[PDB]
Amino acid sequence: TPPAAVLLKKAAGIKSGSGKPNKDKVGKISRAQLQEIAQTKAADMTGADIEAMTRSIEGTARSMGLVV
Amino acid sequence: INPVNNRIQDLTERSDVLRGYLDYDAKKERLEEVNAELEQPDVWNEPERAQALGKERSSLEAVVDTLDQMKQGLEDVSGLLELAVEADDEETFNEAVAELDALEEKLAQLEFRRMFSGEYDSADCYLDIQAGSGGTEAQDWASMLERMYLRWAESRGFKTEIIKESEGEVAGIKSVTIKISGDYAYGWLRTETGVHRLVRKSPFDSGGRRHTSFSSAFVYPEVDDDIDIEINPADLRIDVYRTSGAGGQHVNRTESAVRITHIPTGIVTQCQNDRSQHKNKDQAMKQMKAKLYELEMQKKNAEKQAMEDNKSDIGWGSQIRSYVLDDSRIKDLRTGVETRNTQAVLDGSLDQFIEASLKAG
Amino acid sequence: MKVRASVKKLCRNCKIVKRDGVIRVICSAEPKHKQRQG
RNA sequence: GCGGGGUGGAGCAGCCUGGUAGCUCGUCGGGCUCAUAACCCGAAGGUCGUCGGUUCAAAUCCGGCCCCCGCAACCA
RNA sequence: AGCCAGGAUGUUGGCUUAGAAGCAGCCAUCAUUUAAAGAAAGCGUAAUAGCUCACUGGUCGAGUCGGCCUGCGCGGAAGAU
Ligand SMILES: [Mg+2]
Ligand SMILES: [Mg+2]
Ligand SMILES: [Mg+2]
Ligand SMILES: [Zn+2]
Numbered sequence: 001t002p003p004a005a006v007l008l009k010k011a012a013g014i015k016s017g018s019g020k021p022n023k024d025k026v027g028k029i030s031r032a033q034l035q036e037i038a039q040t041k042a043a044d045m046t047g048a049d050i051e052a053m054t055r056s057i058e059g060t061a062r063s064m065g066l067v068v
Numbered sequence: 069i070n071p072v073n074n075r076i077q078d079l080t081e082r083s084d085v086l087r088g089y090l091d092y093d094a095k096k097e098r099l100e101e102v103n104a105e106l107e108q109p110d111v112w113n114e115p116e117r118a119q120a121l122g123k124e125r126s127s128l129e130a131v132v133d134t135l136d137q138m139k140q141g142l143e144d145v146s147g148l149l150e151l152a153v154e155a156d157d158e159e160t161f162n163e164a165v166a167e168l169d170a171l172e173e174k175l176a177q178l179e180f181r182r183m184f185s186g187e188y189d190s191a192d193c194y195l196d197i198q199a200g201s202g203g204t205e206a207q208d209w210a211s212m213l214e215r216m217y218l219r220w221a222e223s224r225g226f227k228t229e230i231i232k233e234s235e236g237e238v239a240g241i242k243s244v245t246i247k248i249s250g251d252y253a254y255g256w257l258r259t260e261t262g263v264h265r266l267v268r269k270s271p272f273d274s275g276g277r278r279h280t281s282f283s284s285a286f287v288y289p290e291v292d293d294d295i296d297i298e299i300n301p302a303d304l305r306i307d308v309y310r311t312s313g314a315g316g317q318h319v320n321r322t323e324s325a326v327r328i329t330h331i332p333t334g335i336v337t338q339c340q341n342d343r344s345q346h347k348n349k350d351q352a353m354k355q356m357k358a359k360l361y362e363l364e365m366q367k368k369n370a371e372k373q374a375m376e377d378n379k380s381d382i383g384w385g386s387q388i389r390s391y392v393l394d395d396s397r398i399k400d401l402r403t404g405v406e407t408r409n410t411q412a413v414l415d416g417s418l419d420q421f422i423e424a425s426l427k428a429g
Numbered sequence: 430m431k432v433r434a435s436v437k438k439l440c441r442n443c444k445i446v447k448r449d450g451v452i453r454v455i456c457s458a459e460p461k462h463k464q465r466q467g
Numbered sequence: 468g469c470g471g472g473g474u475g476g477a478g479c480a481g482c483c484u485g486g487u488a489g490c491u492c493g494u495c496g497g498g499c500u501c502a503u504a505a506c507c508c509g510a511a512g513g514u515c516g517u518c519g520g521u522u523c524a525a526a527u528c529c530g531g532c533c534c535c536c537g538c539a540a541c542c543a
Numbered sequence: 544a545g546c547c548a549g550g551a552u553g554u555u556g557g558c559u560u561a562g563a564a565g566c567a568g569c570c571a572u573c574a575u576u577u578a579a580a581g582a583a584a585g586c587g588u589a590a591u592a593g594c595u596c597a598c599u600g601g602u603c604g605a606g607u608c609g610g611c612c613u614g615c616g617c618g619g620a621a622g623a624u
Contacts, residue, residue: 003554003555004553004554004556005554005555005556005557008557016557016558016559017557017558018556018557018558018559018569018570018571019557019558019559019569019570020569020570021557021570021571022570022571041553045552045553046551046552046553046575046576047552047553047575047576052574052575052576053553053575055573055574055575056552056553056554056573056574056575057553057574058573058574059553059556059572059573059574059575060553060554060556060557060573060574061556062556062571062572062573062574063554063556063557063570063571063572063573063582064556064557064558064571065556065557065558065570065571112589115589118589119561119562119589122561122562122589123561124561125561126560126561126562127561204503237503237504238502238503238504239502239503272502274501315543316542316543317543318543319543320543322543342540343540343541343543433619434618434619435619436618440585440586441584441585441586441596442585442586447617450617450618451617451618452617452618458586459586466617466618466619467618467619467620
C-alpha cells in the first residue's frame with residue numbers, strides 16, 4: 001500500500017505541518033476522514049479490527065503534528 | 069477581471085524572464101547531467117565531488133521544481149479564473165484571487181532573491197555624493213542629486229539622516245554623506261554607484277551656454293565594528309633578559325628587559341625602560357596590542373584606498389546615467405533605459421532604472 | 430594509551446583492571462579508551 | 468607617587484568663595500550685491516566627562532570611575 | 544553472569560536538511576502484534592544498511608546487585624656531589 005504520511009497530507013490539504021507542533025498547531029484533521037483513509041489500506045495493514053488501524057493512523061497523524 | 073488577466077500576463081512574463089535569465093533550458097540540462105552522474109556508482113568515489121553534486125542537484129532541483137510547479141499553477145489559475153468569470157461565482161472568484169495572491173507572493177520571494185543575491189544587500193547603506201567637473205554647476209547638480217535620492221528614499225519608506233554635508237560657497241553642496249536605513253537598503257541603492265552626467269543651460273554662465281556637469285554617487289553598506297579579540301597567551305612568546313647598559317650589581321644580575329613575540333604574525337615588541345620586570349611586561353603587552361591593532365587598521369585602510377583608486381574619476385568620460393534637460397531625455401548607459409519625464413525622475417522616480425539594473429544583474 | 434590521574438570507563442566495553450599495582454582501563458571495542466593511571 | 472584639566476559646533480572664562488553659564492569665532496533668519504565673500508541688522512545653541520554623595524540648593528564642595536595632560540620614577 | 548532462542552507493526556513519526564531511515568538535530572514520541580521487542584541506550588552507515596542492546600521466552604541451579612557509615616592501604620608523586 002502507499003505510505004500513510006502522503007495520504008495524511010492529501011487528506012489534510014497541507015504541505016508542511018511539523019514545525020513546532022505543540023507550541024502552535026499547524027493543521028488539524030477529523031476522525032471520520034482518518035477512518036475512511038484507514039479502510040482503503042486494509043489489505044496490507046496488519047490487523048482485523050479496522051478500529052485499531054484507525055487509531056494507529058490517528059497516532060501517526062499526531063506524530064506528524066496535526067491534532068485530531 | 070481584466071486587471072486579473074493583466075496580473076496573470078505579468079506573472080507569465082516574470083516567470084519567462086526568470087527562466088531565461090536563469091537559462092531554464094541550460095539549468096534543466098545541467099540538472100539532468102547531474103542526475104546521470106549521481107546515478108552512476110563512480111560519483112560517490114570522491115566524497116567531496118558527491119556532496120558538491122548533491123548540493124548542486126538540490127539547488128537546481130529547487131529552481132527547476134519551483135518553475136515546473138509555478139507554470140502549472142499559473143495555467144490552473146487561468147482556467148479556474150475563466151470558469152469563475154463564466155459562471156459568475158463570487159466565492160470561486162475570491163478563491164482564485166487568494167490563490168493568485170499567494171502565487172504572486174511566491175514568485176515575488178523568488179524574484180527578491182534573484183534581485184538581491186549579494187551578501188550585504190540586506191544591510192543599511194551610506195550614500196556619498198561628490199561634485200565634479202562642473203565646478204559650481206557641478207555642486208548645484210550634486211545638491212539636485214541629493215534631493216532626488218532623499219525623495220526616492222522617502223518613497224520607499226527608508227529612513228535618512230545626513231551624516232555630513234559640505235556646502236559649496238557659491239551654490240549647492242561640495243559633498244554629502246547620507247545614512248539610509250531600511251529593508252535591503254543597500255540592495256536597492258547599490259546599483260546607483262557611478263558618475264551622473266548633467267547637461268543643461270548653465271544657470272551660472274553669464275552667456276547661458278549649454279554646459280555639462282558631473283556628480284558622483286557612491287553607495288557602501290553599513291558595517292558592524294569588529295569584535296575586539298584578546299591576545300591569546302598561547303600565541304605569545306615572552307623572553308626576559310638583562311637590560312643593555314646595565315649599571316650596578318643589581319642591574320647586571322636581574323632579568324628586567326622583556327620581549328614579546330606574536331607567533332602567528334612574527335611582530336615583536338620589547339620594553340626595558342622600567343626597573344620592574346612586571347612593569348616592562350605590562351608596557352610590552354600594551355605595545356603588542358597596539359601593534360596588532362595598527363596592523364589591522366593598516367589592512368583596512370589599504371582596502372579603503374583600493375576602493376578610492378577603483379572609484380571612477382568624476383570626469384567627462386565616466387557616466388552611468390545621462391540627464392540631458394534641453395533634449396528632455398534621461399538615459400542609463402548600462403541598461404539603455406530611457407525616459408522623457410525628467411521632472412519625475414528628478415523628483416524621485418528612480419525605480420525604473422533601479423529595477424532595470426537589478427533585473428539585468 | 431592515555432596516562433593520567435583520573436582513569437574511568439568511557440564506554441560499556443571498558444573494564445577496570447589492576448595489573449602490577451597500577452589501575453588500567455582496557456577496552457575491547459575502542460583502542461582510544463586504553464588508559465593507565467599515572 | 469605628586470599635580471592639573473574635561474563647560475553651546477571650536478577655542479577659552481565662570482569653580483576658588485554653592486544660588487547667577489560669559490567672550491571670540493562658528494550656525495540660523497533678514498538686509499547690501501547681477502551674484503558670492505566682506506559688511507550691516509537680528510536670533511538660536513551647553514541642564515557643565517560619568518556616576519554617585521553633601522546640601523533647602525552643586526558647573527562650583529566631596530568620593531569613585533573614564534579620558535587627557537604634566538611632572539616624578541632614584542642609590543641599584 | 545554467561546548461555547540459547549528471540550529482540551516485531553503502522554513506521555524511515557514528520558520537518559530542516561544536502562541527506563537524516565532509533566541513533567546531525569529539530570521534533571513529536573503514540574497505538575498495534577504480545578512472551579517481549581525503545582518512535583530507541585550504545586556501536587556503526589554519506590545515507591540506508593549493518594552491529595548491538597533495553598525488553599522477553601527456554602535450559603543450568605545458589606546466590607546476586609549497588610549504594611550508606613567506618614578502619615587500614617593504592618595511584619596522582621619530576622632536580623640537580
Ligand atoms: Mg548652578
Ligand atoms: Mg647613577
Ligand atoms: Mg598516597
Ligand atoms: Zn571503551
